[PDB]
Amino acid sequence: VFKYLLSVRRVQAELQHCWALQMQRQTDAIKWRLRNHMAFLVDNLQYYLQVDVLESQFSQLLHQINSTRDFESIRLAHDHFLSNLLAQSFILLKPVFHCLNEILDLCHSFCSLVSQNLGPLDERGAAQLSILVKGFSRQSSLLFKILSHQINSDLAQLLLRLDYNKYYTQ
Amino acid sequence: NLMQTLKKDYRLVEYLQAMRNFFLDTMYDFYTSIFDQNVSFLNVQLQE
Amino acid sequence: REIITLQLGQCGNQIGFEFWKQLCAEHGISPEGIVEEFATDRKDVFFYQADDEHYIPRAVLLDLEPRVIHSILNSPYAKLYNPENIYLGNNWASGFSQGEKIHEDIFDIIDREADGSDSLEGFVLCHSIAGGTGSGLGSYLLERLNDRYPKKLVQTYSVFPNQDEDVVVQPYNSLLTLKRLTQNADCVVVLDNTALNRIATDRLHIQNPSFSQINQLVSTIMSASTTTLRYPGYMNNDLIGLIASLIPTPRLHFLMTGYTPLTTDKTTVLDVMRRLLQPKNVMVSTNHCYIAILNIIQGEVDPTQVHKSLQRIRERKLANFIPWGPASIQVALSRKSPYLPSAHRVSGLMMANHTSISSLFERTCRQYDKLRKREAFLEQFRKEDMFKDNFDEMDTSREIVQQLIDEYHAATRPDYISWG
Amino acid sequence: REIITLQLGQCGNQIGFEFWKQLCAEHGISPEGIVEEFATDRKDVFFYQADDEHYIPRAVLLDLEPRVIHSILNSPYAKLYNPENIYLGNNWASGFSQGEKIHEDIFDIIDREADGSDSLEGFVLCHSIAGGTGSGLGSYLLERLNDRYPKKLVQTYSVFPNQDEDVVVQPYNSLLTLKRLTQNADCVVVLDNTALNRIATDRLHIQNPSFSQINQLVSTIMSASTTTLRYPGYMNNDLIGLIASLIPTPRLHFLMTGYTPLTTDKTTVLDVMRRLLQPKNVMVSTNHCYIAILNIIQGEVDPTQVHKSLQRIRERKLANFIPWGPASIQVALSRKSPYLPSAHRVSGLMMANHTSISSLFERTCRQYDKLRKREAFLEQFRKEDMFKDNFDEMDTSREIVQQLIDEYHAATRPDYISWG
């Protein structure tokens, strides 16, 4: 859990670094700005979702700890804590995991690629730029389709995106 | 004994009373929206 | 992190004083600098720590031909900070030329606190557009901090001067300063003096004492802008974490305001959310659509009715966003501020990008075109002639802001995948 | 749904206060607004929900030259609502002209609660005919709400002033207000002050304290009018579901009243049904026949003797209805109200259309014709001269109500398939 949480947390800051590069500064720059903002949304949403399950589950853990005088329920509370946490990270389910990994990988390569030149890259940057925008659209819609369980926060978040129908048309 | 613990705690009759309160004030507002559709559109109306 | 706040001009120093006084009210501190012994939270967000339970606020005040700065000076709120940074025409060129010569010593005062500050995040400008001495001076200083600091962030709290009418060089001043605002500022918070006048005449029936009640509303918005940082939240505890979602591109970086009461003389988070959507409750006055919104709530916490409300503002369908993008209005929850009595325990705040302000910009552009063609309203002083003999820099500024209007209207379209 | 109740005039504010106090008695709430913690039912039928177990009742009170409103004001029942809506000649033209100028601010007070109300069904008028200041003012305001709201329903609880005799402009006031009542109101509930005086002298031997006991009878009828909505029934849980059967056409929209005890100092539902048929038990005093009746029972429930009683009131043959139509007296059963001690656990209520009130209307018409020909009873003030120099609007009003009498008598006939 620490490994995954730091993976997405690692991505967020260097995306802000790309933001800091672009704001101080053509066709080629503005497409980077659009792709940067569009990536920033979904990468923020992922972390914030894990935060919701952390905040909500921790209270039940502490409450059950503070309401009993028996060991077996405490060990049981640790088990339940783990089961719901690992479920909500979707590390138990493989396609959704095998897509969010690729989101992180494309963002890593994107951060490096924009940081390389502080002028717009028309020297083979367009070649990787088209590959990255197509792959990012593909993966974002695929993982979103897989998620779109039976709980309350998880549903209400999805429906934020289809107030626009932008991860149904991408 | 078995009847006693099935009418309290896994109590059937409360579920039944609710069932005949899902038809039959509150449901006026509920019906009027359906009159003028989607299967989630009903859901958001019921959940309030 | 830490942010040094920068105030100049008469009105800008008034809001700097008002904000720092309000933060003295918000934290458990005396107006003399002494922290209270009946006090959890952070009181180091913008404050240099001296010993005598003294958190000295990190604010640099600037003046030019001072009138109101003397009235700011004689106060019990002048003993909180003032590390001795006081240093001494109503045109843009007046402020620009007078800042031109003395830039080095005020920048030395800046560098003083810069090496004094171990940590840094940004610089906040308390500016007023068409304030006379503030105009020109503020844009010049903005150019200097940008030139010296490509590693820092700049956010500017600035007025949009429109009070339905006399100063005739006002669109010229606003045009030049907005040119500097677009290309030399990282973050812009704009408000309408007309809209705040409207809400002041809403909540009461005043017409003459508008300034003090305007100070009330602006202090509420400025405190709400910083509540997530001054009180320990979880995200946007930095300026940049707050800023990054709001700007999709640095031609669209102008940010909107909101405060949920109209009159400040159980409601769920949905209700303030849905009416913070309404433009009668927005403090800044084809179809315009929002490019990104972030909302901030401080008050009563319903732990599950957040997502229930979220599904509700979805299916309400009051606000349809940008076509060519995944644009959401986004939720932030913070602690309601202790150490002060508070009416309206639930209070809301919106930051958004909207295309509606391009109307205000073309209003100023059309007024500038009218006065420029009519040719009696530049008011022909030695400042303007020494600054530019041929007066083409204003023409270039109008060209750039017209280009910005074109960018605004092209972003308004469902297709902004191509440039322009 | 939700209904904002609207009271004006001295007597109308007295019934507004009395009804809201009685609803405080009926629901498990304090007179201060606090809901009781020893309390199923709905307490949101007309109430804005504040937090402190506070359901704030949604009622707007209006006054003109206030006398009794001050006595209403000093009360523990003034802490339930009063969202600060107090705002300040005995002729119709006096109330009409004084409402003419101040219509906008009281309508702004209306719009306040209108946007405050998420849900809405109707507006209830607490009116008094020939009450002086209430007359004219109420008809003017009725015209304004009708003009502003073609999407809402209006029901008016109004007195018919007849106490067997001094005010000589009374038939003029009643004539004009009834003109506004016929064409600007959706629902009319009328009662006879003479009949309530008769039943008051029936149950006791009072002559001087008639007003308070009249308040008792009217509160019983007004609570019985709303019991199906305030307590969860199944049909006529809306105003419009109750109203729709009762009005066959909007010239026949005047509704009759009933309360089954005479003295309020096992009987089956048949008995109260059959005597709610009797005109000695009706609280409003050729052959007249009912156009539609609806009866409402709250009390002891015999689950099969309802239809047995129905066959019985059929074959009793006490009431033969309209010839040219399928007109039934119809049965409604509701819960008897908890949270208060109650004498007469079975209580009945009738709403009907009857042609008998056209007699009362032609009584007022004949009195108006007599005083108008005799020409000393308009009382010739500046209000009436500024309102109409030639005084033809009263003549037009008499013409329209005479046309209405003709419509009444033609509906009385077995043939009303042709117009008129």
PDB file of C-alpha atoms in Angstrom, chain B residues 23-25 28-29, chain D residues 1 121 232 234 237:
ATOM      1  CA  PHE B  23     -47.393   2.302  -2.402  1.00  0.00           C
ATOM      2  CA  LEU B  24     -49.960   4.194  -0.312  1.00  0.00           C
ATOM      3  CA  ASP B  25     -48.025  13.493   0.753  1.00  0.00           C
ATOM      4  CA  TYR B  28     -47.402  12.805  -4.543  1.00  0.00           C
ATOM      5  CA  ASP B  29     -44.171  14.674  -5.288  1.00  0.00           C
TER       6      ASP B  29
ATOM      7  CA  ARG D   1     -47.012  20.585  -1.377  1.00  0.00           C
ATOM      8  CA  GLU D 121     -48.508  24.416  -3.904  1.00  0.00           C
ATOM      9  CA  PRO D 232     -50.311  11.116   6.065  1.00  0.00           C
ATOM     10  CA  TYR D 234     -53.690   8.722   0.760  1.00  0.00           C
ATOM     11  CA  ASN D 237     -52.794  15.073   0.519  1.00  0.00           C
TER      12      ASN D 237
END
